[PDB]
Amino acid sequence: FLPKPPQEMDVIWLNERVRERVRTSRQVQNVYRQLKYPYVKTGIHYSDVLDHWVQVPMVEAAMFEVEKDGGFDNFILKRSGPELRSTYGERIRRHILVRQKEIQKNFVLQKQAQMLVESMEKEILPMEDGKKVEEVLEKYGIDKEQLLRDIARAAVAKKQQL
Amino acid sequence: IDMACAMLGERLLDTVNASAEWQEAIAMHVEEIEAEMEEVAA
Amino acid sequence: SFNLPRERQILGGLHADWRTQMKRSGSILNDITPALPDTKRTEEQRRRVAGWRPVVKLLGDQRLRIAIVGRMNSGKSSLFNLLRLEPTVPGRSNVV
Amino acid sequence: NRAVDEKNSTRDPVELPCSYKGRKLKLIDTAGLARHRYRADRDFIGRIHGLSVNEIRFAHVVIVVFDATEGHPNKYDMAVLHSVAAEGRPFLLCANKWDAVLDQSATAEAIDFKIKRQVREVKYSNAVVVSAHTGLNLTLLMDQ
Amino acid sequence: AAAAAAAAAAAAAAAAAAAAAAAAAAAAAAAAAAAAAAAAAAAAAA
Amino acid sequence: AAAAAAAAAAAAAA
Amino acid sequence: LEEETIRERVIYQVVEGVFRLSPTSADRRELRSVANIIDYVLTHVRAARPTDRERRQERPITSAALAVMQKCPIQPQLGFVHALPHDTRDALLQEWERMHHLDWQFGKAVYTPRSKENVRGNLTWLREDRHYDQRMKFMQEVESGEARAKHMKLIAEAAGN
Amino acid sequence: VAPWVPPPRHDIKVTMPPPPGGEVGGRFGVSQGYSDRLARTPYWKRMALSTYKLRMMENATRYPMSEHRPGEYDIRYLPTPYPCTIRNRPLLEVGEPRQIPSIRIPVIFLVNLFDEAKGCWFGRRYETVYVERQFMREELMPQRYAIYATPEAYKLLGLPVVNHHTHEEIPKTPREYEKLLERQRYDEERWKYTIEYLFRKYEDGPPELLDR
Ligand SMILES: Nc1nc2c(ncn2[C@@H]2O[C@H](COP(=O)(O)OP(=O)(O)OP(=O)(O)O)[C@@H](O)[C@H]2O)c(=O)[nH]1
DSSP: SSSSTTTTOOOOOOOOOOOOEEEEOOOOOEEEEEEOOOOOOEEEOOTTTSSSSSEEEHHHHHHHHHHHHTTTTHHHHHHHHHTOOOOOHHHHHHHHHHHHHHHHHHHHHHHHHHHHHHHHHHHHHHHOOOOHHHHHHHHHTTOHHHHHHHHHHHHHHHHOOO | OHHHHHHHHHHHHHHHHHOOOOHHHHHHHHHHHHHHHHHHHH | OOOOOOOOOGGOOOOSSSHHHHHHHHHTOOOOOOOOOOOOOOOOHHHHHHHHHOOOOOOOOOSSOOOOSSSSSSSSHHHHHHHOOOOHHHTTTOOO | OOEEEEEEEESSSSEEEEEESSOEEEEEEOOOOHHHHHHHOOOOHHHHHHHHHHHHOOOOOOOEEEEEGGGGGHHHHHHHHHHHHHHOOEEEEEEEEEEHHHHHHHHHHHHHHHHOOOOOOGGGGOOOOOOOTBBBSSSHHHHH | OOHHHHHHHHHHHHHHHHHHHHTHHHHHHHHHHHHHHHOOOOOOOO | EEEOSSSSSSSOOO | OOOHHHHHHHHHIIIIIIIOOOOOHHHHHHTSHHHHHHHHHHHHHHHOOHHHHHHHHHHOHHHHHHHHHHSOOOOOOOOOGGGGGGOOHHHHHHHHHHHTTTTHHHHOOOOOSSSOOTTOOOHHHHHHHHHHHHHHHHHHHHTTTTHHEEEEOOOOOOOOO | OOSOOOOOOOOOOSSOOOOHHHHSOOOSOOOOOHHHHHHHHOOHHHHHHHHHHHHHHHHHOOOOOOOSSSTTTTTTTSSSSSSSSSSSSOSSSSOOOOOOOOOOOEEESSOOEEEETEEEEOOOTTTTEEEEEHHIIIIHHHHTTTTOOOHHHHHHTSSSSOOOOOSSOOOOOHHHHHHHHHHHHHHHGGGGGGHHHHTGSSSSSSSTSOOO
């Protein structure tokens, strides 16, 4: 059995369950039984998607399975609702899914920015005059002040690194 | 838009270094950034 | 194609040999501990042992000294307890 | 002999003749005494305990070692002391690991309190602190 | 030393206010606000 | 290239 | 706890001359502390700062940029923020938890939107990047017309079978 | 009260009933699946909708294994409708003492990490190294200097895919861990177990016979 029903067990017990072991006395007349529980280790893992350390009560089997799956996020995603009987597990699963969608959105944003910069670079590859540069800048909806500030920041970073 | 601005700025810097008033403004911004970095380090 | 995964037959991780199960059980069954190997004596320990002094003088038995050597379970202890005869301390039998 | 951290390092008695201050003697080392609780489960160590008791029964003086790191003699230590007293051998008590014990004064007070609380002639037993590694009061122990 | 204490407190308050403004770059917008709409500054939050 | 000791970084925030 | 006498004059000489504010009766009553006054000034300047709506109104998106973004083969899927759990608890308890390490101890985690993210070791980023690469390969195949030929061959062999 | 009762979890079949609920969902205790839609549908209608080829396809059942849970016996044939526990047994037996050595796991390094204290290299970029579990989960992973070695990870990184059976069968003794290490070494350097390599030291002849 488990200490709590499947819908209430907050801890992550993959397959470990409470089991009673039986031992006979020195004389075989009588027997004594005792319950045994798994070794619960607080898994303080790091999830790449969240980028921040997350700790949750777990078991040695849970830690080994996380290592097998190659990541806490992968382990949680592989484990399904009924299979992962943890409310904490469900909360972290929702956080991980939201963060994964955010990762995808950020990648799409980066790709859109790359396409825009490539298009404008094709447009203004030659250098003709600041007037035409500003005309293209307003055509593409960009501020010269922030363009200059980011150019200066990039130059500072380049100088610092070399 | 902002990320496109940053990427365009770095690409323009790369092209320029591979090759007036805007240059002066860039120099002033560089000086300001250097001063801010020095203050943060201090 | 049509095959079943390899899996142990005896359940519970038990062993088909009660001797293996006994050695797994351990102390309560196998009371006798295994052979004791030579201890790891450090250089500092050797130096301290050399520096020690005898608070009492050990006497070299004037009678002929004969030592029995050999491998384990060679009957050396049985031969020793057959030859030995203690008139003053009865019950001095070496464990065999 | 050989000393190792293992509980039952030696399983047979050992006798070494020697003279201290011009007085012959045979220093005897025993395997060790265990409580009946442990012996019943492990009769073999019970066998070596019986072998040790046999030599205690024939010794002319008995010296009971108890580790000072424990801080005071155990109930089984007092049981062994009473056993040797009943056998009728001059019994002495020695606290070992004195170079390792931390609170020397507290350990000495505890030992003295135990000796005083002892009821029979064991109450008159004299306790001496002796250290093996350092080698402290060995001559005093032999003199006693 | 009431006057000295008052002067020191005023100087410390001015320095702290300047540091706080510089932390959030408030002075940048504050200069324009003072130049144009010093009467009152408020941004519709909705 | 990067360098790191055996205890420089701790998962939790010390 | 600044005394009222010195306070009045300090506020009149600094806030009016520097920030040109106007606290109310209760505001001045609560402004006894230097920390309180500086926090009030910070809050008021923060409110006065331009709003995101105002900034967008003054700097709207341009038709060319919108067209390029729409033509981009990839578009985002928003609404992921609607999925993270919404805990209904005590405000003070939540403040305590966030200040301490309890914010991550038991199935909890804070959410902060990010524009740029670290890619090194990001399995999600790597898998989406490979997905995009294979999508680009598929687009190249479609442009070259190989996909049309393959589909025609598949249909022809299916009909023949 | 349930205004809407969810249908059977996996009822794609047109004639055969859905598998037992425990096989696909998360609730066991029954060996025979049921679907009210299929039961109520007249036999003639089901046969009309289906075709002999489709009927045989949907009738084909994997025995004794399960179709949905690969590598596990289906619950409808076990003595009880609950899943077999032999494969998913708990990590430690009731009487087994915990004696598990400090197992090492394979980690792909994403950046050349230089151990300055030891004056060496932990591992080069995109290289696999067997490291300590605690070390990997405590320092390498949070620093993003390396990741666990998985076939999916290799596929993502573009490196050749190798299926390191990490924790496939968790060892329970130092001897079992040694057996696991030996199996890993064999699977890695299979070429070292050839007859030629085994007799390499006797390539030409006995050293004593060989002249100096
Ligand atoms: N530090 C310290 N340790 C001591 C001293 N005397 C004995 N010991 C301990 O005794 C241990 C060695 O065991 P032995 O000397 O063989 O004593 P034993 O365990 O009773 O062995 P047997 O009597 O042969 O059964 C060492 O590990 C020490 O910890 C001492 O004077 N100082």
